[PDB]
Amino acid sequence: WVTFYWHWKHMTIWGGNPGQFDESSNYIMGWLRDYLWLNSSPLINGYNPFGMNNLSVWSWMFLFGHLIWATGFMFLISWRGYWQELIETLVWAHERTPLANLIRWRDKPVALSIVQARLVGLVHFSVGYILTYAAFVIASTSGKF
Amino acid sequence: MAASFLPSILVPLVGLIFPAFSMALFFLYVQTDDIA
Amino acid sequence: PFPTFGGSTGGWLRAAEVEEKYAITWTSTKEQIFEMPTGGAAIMRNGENLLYLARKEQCLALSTQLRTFKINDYKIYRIFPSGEVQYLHPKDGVFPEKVNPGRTSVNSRGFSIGKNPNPASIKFSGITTYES
Amino acid sequence: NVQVFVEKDAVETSFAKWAQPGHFSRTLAKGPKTTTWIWNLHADAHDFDSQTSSLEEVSRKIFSAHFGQLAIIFLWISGMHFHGAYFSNYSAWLTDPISIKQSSQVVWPIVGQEILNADVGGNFQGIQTTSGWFQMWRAEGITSEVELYWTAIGGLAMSAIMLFAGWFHYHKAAPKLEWFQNAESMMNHHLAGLLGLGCLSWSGHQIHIALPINKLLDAGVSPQEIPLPHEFLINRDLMAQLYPSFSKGLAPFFGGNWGEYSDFLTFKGGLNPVTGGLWLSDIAHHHLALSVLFIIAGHMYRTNWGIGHNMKEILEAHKGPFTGEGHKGLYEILTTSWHAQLAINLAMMGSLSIIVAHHMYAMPPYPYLATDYATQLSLFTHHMWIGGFCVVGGAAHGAIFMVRDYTPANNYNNLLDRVLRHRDAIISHLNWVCIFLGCHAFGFYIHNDTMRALGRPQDMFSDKAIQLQPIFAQWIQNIHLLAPGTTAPNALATTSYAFGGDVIEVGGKIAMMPIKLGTADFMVHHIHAFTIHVTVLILLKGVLYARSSKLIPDKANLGFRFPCDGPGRGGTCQSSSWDHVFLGLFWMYNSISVVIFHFSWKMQSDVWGTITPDGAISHITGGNFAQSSITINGWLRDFLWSQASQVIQSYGSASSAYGLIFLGAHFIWAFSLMFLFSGRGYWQELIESIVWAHNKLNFAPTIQPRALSITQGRAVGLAHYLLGGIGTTWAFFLARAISIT
Amino acid sequence: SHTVKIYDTCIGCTQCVRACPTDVLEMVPWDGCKSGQIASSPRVEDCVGCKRCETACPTDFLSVRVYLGAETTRSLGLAY
Amino acid sequence: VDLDYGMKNSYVPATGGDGGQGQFGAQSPNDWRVAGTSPVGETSYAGAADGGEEPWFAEAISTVSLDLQKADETLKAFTKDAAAFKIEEFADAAMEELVGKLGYSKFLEMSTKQLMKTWGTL
Amino acid sequence: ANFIKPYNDDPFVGHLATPITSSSLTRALLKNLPAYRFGLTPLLRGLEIGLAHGYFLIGPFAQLGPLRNSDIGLLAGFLSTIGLILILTLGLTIYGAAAFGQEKSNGSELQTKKSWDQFKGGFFVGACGSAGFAFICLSSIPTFAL
Ligand code: CLA
Ligand code: CLA
Ligand code: CLA
Ligand code: CLA
Ligand code: CLA
Ligand code: CLA
Ligand SMILES: CCCCCCCCCCCCCCCC(=O)OC[C@H](COP(=O)(O)OC[C@@H](O)CO)OC(=O)CCCCCCCCCCCCCCC
Ligand SMILES: CC1=C(/C=C/C(C)=C/C=C/C(C)=C/C=C/C=C(C)/C=C/C=C(C)/C=C/C2=C(C)CCCC2(C)C)C(C)(C)CCC1
Ligand SMILES: CC1=C(/C=C/C(C)=C/C=C/C(C)=C/C=C/C=C(C)/C=C/C=C(C)/C=C/C2=C(C)CCCC2(C)C)C(C)(C)CCC1
Ligand SMILES: CC1=C(C/C=C(\C)CCC[C@H](C)CCC[C@H](C)CCCC(C)C)C(=O)c2ccccc2C1=O
Ligand code: SF4
Ligand code: SF4
Secondary structure (H helix, E strand, O other), rough: HHHHHHHHHHHHHHHHHHHHHHHHHHOOOHHHHHHHHHHHOOOHHOEOOOOOOHHHHHHHHHHHHHHHHHHHHHHHOHHHHHHHHHHHHHHHHHHOOOOOOOOOOOOOOOOOHHHHHHHHHHHHHHHOOOOHHHHHHHHHHHHHH | HHHHHHHHHHHHHHHHHHHHHHHHHHHHHHHHOOOO | OEOOOOEEEEEEHHHHOOOOOEEEEEEOOOOOOOEEOOOOEEEOOEEEEEEOOOOOOHHHHHHHHHOOOOOOOEEEEEOOOOOOOOEEEEEEEOOOOOOOOOOOOOOOOOHHHHHHHOOHHHOOOOOOHOOO | OOOOOOOEEEOOOOOOOHHOOOOOOOOHHHOOOOOHHHHHHHOOOOHHHHHHHHHHHHHHHHHHHHHHHHHHHHHHHHHHHHHHHHOHHHHHHHHOOOOOOEEEEOOOOOOHHHHHEEEEOOOOOOEEOOOHHHHHHHHHEEEEEEHHHHHHHHHHHHHHHHHHHHHHHHHHHHOOOHHOOOHHHHHHHHHHHHHHHHHHHHHHHHHHHHHHHHOOOOOOOOOOHHHHHHHHHHOOHHHHOOOOOHHHHHHHHHHHEEEEEEEEOOOOOOOOOOOOOOOHHHHHHHHHHHHHHHHHHHHEEOOOOOOOHHHHHHHHHOOOOOOOOOOHHHHHHHHOOHHHHHOOOOOOOHHHHHHHHHHHHOOOOOOOOOOOOHHHHHHHHHHHHHHHHHHHHHHHHHHHHHHHHHOOOOOOOHHHHHHHHOOOHHHHHHHHHHHHHHHHHHHHHHHHHHHHHHOOOOHHHOOOOOOOOOOOHHHHHHHHHHHHHHOOOOOOOOOHHOOOOOOOEOOEEEEEEEOOOHHHHHHHHHHHHHHHHHHHHHHHHHHHOOOOOOOOOOHHHHHHOOOOOOOOOOOOOOOOOOHHHHHHHHHHHHHHHHHHHHHHHHHHHHHHHHEEEOOOOEEEOOOEEEEEEEEHHHHHHHHHHHHHHHHHHHOOOOOHHHHHHHHHHHHHHHHHHHHHHHHHHHHHHHHHHHHHHOOHHHHHHHEEEOOOOOOHHHHHHHHHHHHHHHHHHHHHHHHHHHHHO | OOOOEEEEEOOOHHHHHOOOOOOOOEEEEEEOOOOOEEEEEOOOHOOOOOOOHHHOOOOOOOEEEOOOOOOOOOOOOOOO | OOOHHHOOOOOOOOOOOOOOOOOOOOOOOOOOOOOOOOOOOOOOOOOOOOOOOOOHHHHHOOOOOOOHHHHHHHHHHOHHHHHHHHHHHHHHHHHHHHHHHHHHHHHHHHHHHHHHOOOOOO | OOOOOOOOHHOOOOOEEHHHOOOOOOHHHHHOOOOOOOOOOOHHHHHHHHHHHHHHHHHHHHHHHHOOOOHHHHHHHHHHHHHHHHHHHHHHHHHHHHHHHHOOOOOOOOOOOHHHHHHHHHHHHHHHHHHHHHHHHHHHOOOOOO
């Protein structure tokens, strides 16, 4: 919220129209439409069916961050028992598969622990959050000005 | 020999050779049964 | 003395061969269908039955089910790969829920749970508060 | 012997138990001591088999509750007809279906909300509605609001009748369990009577009423000049003017010269060029043939007259060398478990809803439906969602069967037993299939995004590059395009223009045209296969590991719905089959979301649009699907960002409710994550501090406040997640489609 | 292996012993309470840590406490 | 047959957060980390079963069994102290009278006064 | 009458004898593969396996790699195959080190350190040579026209 506020106020100042922030920041749709949607444009066109420019790395990082954040959702929402039961069938399959059962693990595969899954989900969430916003702020500011 | 050659020399060493050997070494260390 | 069972993919794995295995025996007085803890139904034999399982918890789940059949003579053993056996349950011939003379209390602390010492008081000792 | 057995005055009618909340449950009957009680009361209200151990009582409760649901549905239909009769522009829309926007909801002027009364045309202001009421009413032959009023009155009467019937069959005449266990007779009646006679009578309405009225309405006759429906019944000359074979009457029907009725029972296929919908004569022939089929099907099972099949016999005979006892025991399961029946029936009804969505878009059955893009989008999406929920519910009730009604003794060496005996193989192979599908299908998109970002378009998976042509689908499309003359020689046109053929144009808008399949369609169809396989993995794991697993050997004793078995064994959170339903619901949401996005973008890009009298086609999004849908960036930019313009720019217009609901759905979706990501220990500890503040001022409820249970935390989180995500897509679709229609 | 301790508030109700899925606990004679018995955990090597015993215990606060510790094959509930 | 065979494992209990080896041992004395399957005619580990013409499923062959005699004998061996306690409290030959008159499991299950009652018969 | 039975007549092992696991085709195939075939030296098992794999591994690289449309595409595909073989050989080496330790092996069985080293070397030679052979074969594709 803090950085969104800073960035939108500065983007409207730098764009020569502070009045856009002054009027549209008073309701949420103003933030969604005039800050995020409007300023997504150069970022999402870093590459497209017609070519690419030097902002394509930020477009890719933007999608990368969305993906990492969503993958963190998996660890945060689904918990351990489901995964442990699934890994049990995986162990069964490997032990019973010819030419692959020539090779065996020396550390029994187990699902991630309860706390470990909370931490992994949190790390994925945080990395995705940071990378998405960094790509957006850099690409939007640099592709506009 | 020139320094301008260094990226194409060094980047494959940093990004392919070094991680592979580091991962192999860590794997061997974690599989070792008596480390001390 | 195996029950009538067509087999499943849920049975024991390499661990039963290399780490440890479990066996449960019991006496049934008739042929009756029961639920295998590993999935599926098996038919008990009239007389002695023997069943092999990967985990002690599986044996105890089966014994809990046997209790609903009025069967209380089940015995549970652990078998090691060398062939050594350990008699596990009921350890002294009496169910643990029934108090028995000759058992000694293990792991009691002679105070209520609120009297364990403070963590900061045993730092660097290697012990925990519940063990001191 | 199929007989009616009913107990009279089974249950007294009284308000005493209405004053005793939780009366149905022995535990909940003692009254609340914590707020948990309250939640439990709603959770266990319709869990009839936990309120009593008698199957007969459960059956009686289910029967009466079904009547209650029917009463509610009749009330809903009657309300829709009443709103059509008094708060709609149906009469004006009848005269010009092309330029007037259908509207059947009006809002009161208060706090400025009257802006929602859009200028929909016909001297009428209101909300543009997308449920297809006007098209259905016009197809039925409804030409006046008075007919709608009478249909609404009858709907009210039927709602009251259903409510009385429910009261009567619970409190006055409750059938015995032996009555309910009449699978053969029930199938005979529901096939021959409900489906067969329903089809026959609807075909009668279509032949006698809907067909001539629609022939006149298409011919350009005004609704105020069309003869009243009963005139077509009492004037065989009126019908003879329109369909000449009516001048022969019923003589050909009993004589066997049915070809004489070829003028009103047709096999044209295609669409009506004037309306853009199916020919009503084809629909009438369809319903007549279906009625015959169902009436035949309803004489298969033996009830009282010696002849007929016993279902248990048929099931018992079907066993082979790979399947032990085969289908033995299934009849007992499906005649003693309501959960087994509900699992089957929810699975079927949901799959049928999905099928309905597809078939109704591709072969638009109502007049002026095809060019009402808002209605087409809303109907497809709605039926997709309903189907997804119903298939997941079928899975859930299969799991409930496994936990509660499965008996090992009755399932020795039958199909169910052997499935349980190779669950590990089934789940391991499904897991591998899911990984393979996910990796390849989604890696196509990831590869494409990376190649395009690196400035390597020629290395992409695309039509202009490395191609992934859906050759099997294309082969099928060609076969269906060639069918009308050769493999269906009596069909005059294709079953659907989506397979190939001309462009059907109504009012300058495209009703249907061939839907071509390329690399992008290949990739998206494999995404659909992937998501469905993962959803099946989760739900089938929930059913097959419902009773036991290597982790928790005695899961059935813990029940269908329990949070966990403790942090031991590494941690056992969400091991219950209810938790598998919980995760499967998220995956179904993902799957259906992708399906409806694929529909929306493909139809806008390649089907819908305008068409000049010359022949120039201008699609809504300009044919960008093929090159934009092959990357995730193209979906984020060319679908979401671009098509969200209407919903985010809707403030200050009649669509502003959609912008508001878009925002509120985002809010509720984010609100759900608090429940999904957290745990009740934290919240109970916080509540302790809040209870302290209340106690510090000498007051606190004797119903002690409690954080939600673990399972209720999950349920609430998922419910708000689904409401938020689905409502966001709802607002987005509706604003977009109202703009483009 | 997990640690399972019995505190002297135990009333010898035998509910933790009946709740245990792996037979870690047993009742032993004791003069500290009316029932004349106390819980004991001689077989903590088989404790999985499910805490069903704690769920079953009627005292306030608990008289049986499970502290999770070093994991083994037995404590992880592995069939492999 | 040694009774501490289970306890004689390599598990070294930690100084904290560890219940140690209880009545039978924390873990098996046998190293579970063994080799995968092996070609025709070869054994993967010391006591492995020869899978014959199907070595890939060699691990599905059982070399660990419990014959009823071993079960009875280990039952007696593991409960020898409990039987010694029961005769110590009821009171060599007397134990042989009781455990043959009614049974060994029943002798464990009964009570010292009840056994004082059955000793009344002869 | 019953094409499924418990594996090894043992109902309680987690396996079933089905046509997939226990048909004559499956048994003959598996017993004849070099990972299982009686009488092979570990080096020869490794060699046969490498020969089988390196031949097909070049195809994806040659036909779908970045330089597939250049006239040195086959050479680049061969180089990519060699790189993949090196990655796999590293995997085999560290696997053997972990699975068997570094002590001197007491036997000639494949599941021993010395035998596994021989097998790994045979695999590397077989795979690299097979990739080279496939390179030669792909240098001139016969149309088979008289
Ligand atoms: C720690 C700061 C730092 C970082 C993040 C980088 C990053 C990079 N260097 Mg640079 N480099 C650095 C310091 C750093 N360098 C210093 C101090 C020197 C003078 C010796 C160089 C000399 C150098 C040359 C000649 C080249 C690079 C190149 C690169 C790029 C490719 C990686 C590579 O192949 O380098 C190889 C790096 C070395 C041979 C020397 C590395 C020396 C630093 C101090 C190692 C840092 C260790 C680090 C602090 C450990 C903590 C990290 C870990 C915990 C995650 C990459 C952007 C290549 C490039 O520019 O491609 C376009 C390239 O050709 N670097
Ligand atoms: C199918 C369901 C359905 C739905 C969702 C609607 C929805 C609507 N109707 Mg329609 N309508 C329906 C069926 C439906 N109707 C039927 C069957 C008829 C024939 C009777 C009508 C006849 C009709 C007319 C004539 C009008 C509407 C109007 C409306 C609109 C305003 C409603 C309102 O705010 O009233 C006021 C709402 C209240 C007074 C809320 C009271 C809620 C009670 C107190 C709580 C009940 C809870 C429980 C049952 C009671 C427990 C306690 C109790 C025992 C004491 C709204 C869009 C109005 C409209 O469209 O204006 C342009 C309007 O004029 N409807
Ligand atoms: C929450 C549940 C729900 C809701 C609110 C809706 C809402 C709607 N449905 Mg949908 N529907 C649903 C579930 C739901 N549906 C399910 C589960 C199915 C699969 C059977 C359908 C199949 C369906 C069809 C075929 C049609 C609708 C239509 C409609 C719209 C008009 C309502 C109407 O009165 O048409 C009344 C319905 C008709 C006039 C046609 C009914 C024809 C079907 C084949 C009758 C089947 C009845 C049969 C006895 C059911 C038993 C199945 C059997 C295998 C046992 C409205 C948007 C109609 C529409 O889109 O109009 C524009 C429409 O034609 N629905
Ligand atoms: C034919 C349809 C049908 C029927 C008759 C049943 C019947 C039953 N279900 Mg099943 N189920 C179904 C479909 C059905 N279900 C579907 C489609 C799903 C997938 C979602 C499920 C998944 C499911 C689970 C996971 C469980 C059940 C359970 C039950 C039993 C308890 C019901 C209860 O007390 O809830 C009382 C009803 C409520 C508390 C109402 C809940 C309101 C929902 C959550 C939100 C409504 C949102 C609303 C429409 C939108 C509002 C928006 C607005 C606020 C802005 C009962 C036997 C439970 C059971 O234990 O079975 C033995 C159980 O745990 N069902
Ligand atoms: C976008 C976020 C996200 C992602 C990426 C995943 C991914 C996955 N989920 Mg998860 N899930 C999610 C959200 C997500 N989920 C959420 C929010 C929840 C809570 C409801 C869940 C709850 C859940 C359940 C209940 C289940 C899954 C399962 C899966 C796996 C499905 C099988 C598969 O396709 O593997 C393939 C891998 C992918 C599709 C990911 C990327 C593939 C890339 C693009 C191609 C291959 C790259 C390759 C590995 C090279 C990597 C290079 C690297 C070394 C640098 C897959 C790993 C299921 C499972 O495990 O089935 C076997 C399963 O049962 N998830
Ligand atoms: C997962 C889906 C997927 C697929 C199918 C592809 C496919 C491709 N990628 Mg892409 N890519 C992907 C995801 C994917 N990618 C992801 C997630 C990234 C990271 C963002 C990339 C980044 C990337 C880059 C930078 C490049 C590629 C390139 C390529 C091409 C050459 C790759 C190659 O030669 O591998 C070699 C393949 C193998 C060695 C083996 C393939 C698997 C075999 C065939 C399975 C056989 C199983 C068999 C049937 C089982 C039974 C057999 C029998 C014994 C019974 C190829 C078209 C290159 C290119 O130039 O594209 C044109 C390239 O430079 N990709
Ligand atoms: C294209 C649709 C999805 C295809 C999925 C996989 C394609 C692979 C081909 C499998 C089709 C034939 C299956 C065997 C042929 C078949 O139809 O049944 C043949 C045979 C039937 O045996 P009997 O003659 O004993 O049958 C008597 C019957 O009356 C059953 O009681 O079934 C079996 O041998 C066991 C079936 C499990 C076989 C598992 C095979 C792998 C299944 C893949 C998962 C299926 C997904 C569908 C779930 C709804
Ligand atoms: C829409 C709606 C509605 C309405 C409905 C209606 C109006 C219905 C009707 C219906 C009808 C109106 C029905 C009818 C029926 C009929 C029938 C189904 C008949 C049958 C018959 C037959 C089977 C025949 C036979 C025969 C012959 C062929 C010859 C000889 C003689 C005889 C007769 C035997 C309501 C209100 C509900 C509300 C909701 C919506
Ligand atoms: C049969 C069959 C099948 C399969 C197929 C396959 C899978 C095949 C494969 C094949 C293959 C995969 C082949 C391979 C080949 C290889 C080769 C042919 C190699 C050779 C090589 C060489 C000759 C080399 C040599 C060398 C060396 C060693 C070293 C040095 C160098 C050189 C070069 C000299 C199926 C299932 C369909 C079914 C039907 C039948
Ligand atoms: C926020 C949250 C809570 C706290 C939320 C609670 C206790 C819900 C409170 C519901 C209220 C009290 C009922 C509705 C009442 C209105 C909000 C206010 C009206 C007040 C009176 C009229 C009753 C949990 O208990 C919880 C449990 C498990 C997982 C996640 C969570 C979780 O995320
Ligand atoms: S209490 Fe919560 S965190 Fe602990 S095991 Fe149960 S579900 Fe998991
Ligand atoms: S520890 Fe608790 S449950 Fe166990 S006997 Fe003592 S009071 Fe009862």
